[PDB]
Amino acid sequence: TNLCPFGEVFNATRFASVYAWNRKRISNCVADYSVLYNSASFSTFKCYGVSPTKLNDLCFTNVYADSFVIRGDEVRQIAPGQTGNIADYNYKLPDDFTGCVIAWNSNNLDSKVGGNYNYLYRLFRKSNLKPFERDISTEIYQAGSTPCNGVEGFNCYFPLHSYGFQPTYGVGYQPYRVVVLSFELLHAPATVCG
Amino acid sequence: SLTEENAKTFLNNFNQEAEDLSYQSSLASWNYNTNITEENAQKMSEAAAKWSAFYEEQSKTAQSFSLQEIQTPIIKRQLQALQQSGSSALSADKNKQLNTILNTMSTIYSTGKVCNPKNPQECLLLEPGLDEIMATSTDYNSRLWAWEGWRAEVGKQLRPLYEEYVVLKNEMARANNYNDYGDYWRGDYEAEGADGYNYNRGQLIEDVEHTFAEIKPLYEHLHAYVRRKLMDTYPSYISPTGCLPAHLLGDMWGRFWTNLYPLTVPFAQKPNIDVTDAMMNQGWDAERIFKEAEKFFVSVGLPHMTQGFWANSMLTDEADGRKVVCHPTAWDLGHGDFRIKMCTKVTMDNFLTAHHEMGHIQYDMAYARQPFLLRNGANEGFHEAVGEIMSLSAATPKHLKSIGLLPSDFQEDSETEINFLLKQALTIVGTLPFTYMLEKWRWMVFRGEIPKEQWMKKWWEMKREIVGVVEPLPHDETYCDPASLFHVSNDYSFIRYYTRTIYQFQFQEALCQAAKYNGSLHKCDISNSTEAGQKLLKMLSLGNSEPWTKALENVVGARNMDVKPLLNYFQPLFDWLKEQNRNSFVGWNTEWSPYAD
Ligand SMILES: *[C@@H]1O[C@H](CO)[C@@H](O)[C@H](O)[C@H]1NC(C)=O
Ligand SMILES: *[C@@H]1O[C@H](CO)[C@@H](O)[C@H](O)[C@H]1NC(C)=O
Ligand SMILES: *[C@@H]1O[C@H](CO)[C@@H](O)[C@H](O)[C@H]1NC(C)=O
């Protein structure tokens, strides 16, 4: 019966790479998303559920909050159904997903001159992933059928690449921090209030 | 499964790594050309070496992909572009020799001095010690000796260099399935892969000859016309029938002819248009010069320039303290990094080169969508023409009037048109003969169809039979003149400055056809429309993904160098030149001797 760490999710200073996206379950909130809604500073507030109003008025059962870092032109990929270079290899939302997708270009903070190499994204994989299922693996990707036994070589590639950010980039190649709120209502008595 | 999926995967990896490698290397190169020190000079070494090494290593791998099973065209063109080892087809020793000799060329062009024969102390160099001598100093013997000494020095200092360089580059191109390095260059237009759009690698010469005899009448007209007044200047050396002496020409070599503007200007009473004092008395600075060029590109519907451009570029020479290169260039580093490098003195010419460079950019910004091997202009020619139709569409009186940069009462009379068209002709029809002659000579000197012992003889012969310029004195083969030109001993495909010429006017008419235009081509603008921009964009954002013939046909409807529209653009000057040539001898002979007494 108190306000809960939404801020501590947003104003952290260690956002983790897209593939290794952490998740901070939250519970039992008197949650006011409107002090979020009225930010007017986010680069992407595309909601796929009920309006910020009914969010603020209704109490849900349990919430989940994702957070990661991707280039600019890939804030459209995180959306209910969107293929692309990552989009299904790193974080692929489901078809009826009912949460919001917050995203803001923090170039200055997350991207230091010379390259902020500490952000990783998983390139080509064997198959398209599923809802919410992270993939931490690092097993070498076998292009054809020749065995290479865990050393990158001819037609044997490493999945995790890294896009070294910088500040002297375009408005579409800068680290757009993203946070995904996934709600759901079950038979349990609803906990997160507003 | 088949080699297709393996190729596709390899292209994914290569893209996703080469982007960042190239970005870092090119940003180091940028920081050099803005802040030249010893620090940034060194810092250019490691990143460039890293890029070259990645290219070597990742190209050597893409050769097990034998192109027989590539059905899709995109991947086929990609692999076809990546499977070139540049000069690596040599042994390490020959490659070392080649880079050594190329750098000898570059430096021996950067240096080079001549000391006046009566003034053994005023010893100058090609760059701005000799350029101004052979631009305005009208005294005959002065420029005569200046040109002569420059050619003599650089000949005795470059003949063996180019002599061996030809053999080395020929062996290199020989090792990569090409008849000569001339075939290597020609392979830049070799675009193919559709119904009829196949353009061979040898058809280029046929289109060149087909497109140059159609322009020959205008150039013979203008040559005889210019010769009239240049004979009026020195009625002692100019020939009434032969070609005019070489050294008494516009620029160092004759490649441009805008330096001979006053000595043969039309009627010297009309006010030639210029607005230097206009915005100079309004107090515009560099940023305001570029604001207008951006406004011009946003009017026509092309994309609005980006915010990173305005904070990272180098619009104007900074306060001081830094040694800059001072030459306008459009850097696109990648990843959405668009920057312009240039020192901007408020001027009419630095108001058009604004439009030119921002055109270069607005091109490089459109095809930031293809997979990084399709990130060059449709060929080596479209680029310097896309940023050129924007220049020629910015020198109209109508544009300058719209922004009110000159008195909003100008009349646009006949004499204005004629003087302006002659101004533009003395560069656009002046560069074509020399460009074509030089490139037809390099092409004939690579194929060894001329003896190494015989290089300057046929050189000057072609010079005087296709350009209309005679040498001041008969040099022997102890010299190598055309190497003197910067673009020769610096390994640049020089036919690029030929094709685009034709191209631009073609392009011009195309937009003017869709821009709902009526008047004479030369008096046309493109702004305040949308289709005149989108019909260019449709080809703009393709790179060389598509064989350049199709990209061309998307805008012009033609499929080759098709120079009807150029002669349409110079039509008023064509007529007026005819009228001023009712009592002259359009054409020349070859009998003037330097001294037959
Ligand atoms: C900002 O972060 C700190 C530490 O994570 C937290 O204590 C604080 O509550 C956050 N700001 C707000 C407004 O909640
Ligand atoms: C210019 O170079 C100097 C030393 O090479 C460096 O200290 C300085 O930061 C540079 N200036 C800029 C604007 O990069
Ligand atoms: C373009 O249109 C604007 C407003 O419609 C006008 O101010 C300007 O003079 C026009 N310029 C040209 C070249 O048509």
Author numbering:
A (entry chain E): 333 to 526
B (entry chain A): 19 to 615
Which lines from the publication concern this structure?
Human angiotensin-converting enzyme 2 (hACE2) has been demonstrated as the functional receptor for SARS-CoV-27,8. SARS-CoV-2 cannot infect standard laboratory mice due to inefficient interactions between the receptor-binding domain (RBD) of Spike (S) protein and mouse ACE2 (mACE2).
As expected, the RBD of WT SARS-CoV-2 presented no detectable binding, but RBDs from different passages of mouse-adapted strains (RBDMASCp6, RBDMASCp25, and RBDMASCp36) gain gradually enhanced binding abilities to mACE2 with affinities ranging from ~500 to 2 μM. Finally, to elucidate the molecular basis for the gradual changes in specificity of MASCp36, structural investigations of the mACE2 in complex with RBDMASCp25 or RBDMASCp36 were carried out. However, only the tight binding conformation was observed in the mACE2-RBDMASCp36 complex structure, reflecting a more stable/mature binding mode for the RBDMASCp36 to mACE2, akin to that of the RBDWT and hACE2. The overall structure of the mACE2-RBDMASCp36 complex resembles that of the RBDWT-hACE2 complex with a root mean square deviation of 1.0 Å. The RBDMASCp36 recognizes the helices (α1 and α2) located at the apical region of the mACE2 via its receptor-binding motif (RBM). The interaction area on the mACE2 could be primarily divided into three patches (PI, PII, and PIII), involving extensive hydrophilic and hydrophobic interactions with three regions separately clustered by three adaptation-mediated mutated residues (K417N, corresponding to Clus1; Q493H, corresponding to Clus2; and N501Y, corresponding Clus3) in the RBM. Contrarily, structural superimposition of the RBDWT over the mACE2-RBDMASCp36 complex reveals the loss of these interactions, leading to the inability of the RBDWT to bind mACE2.
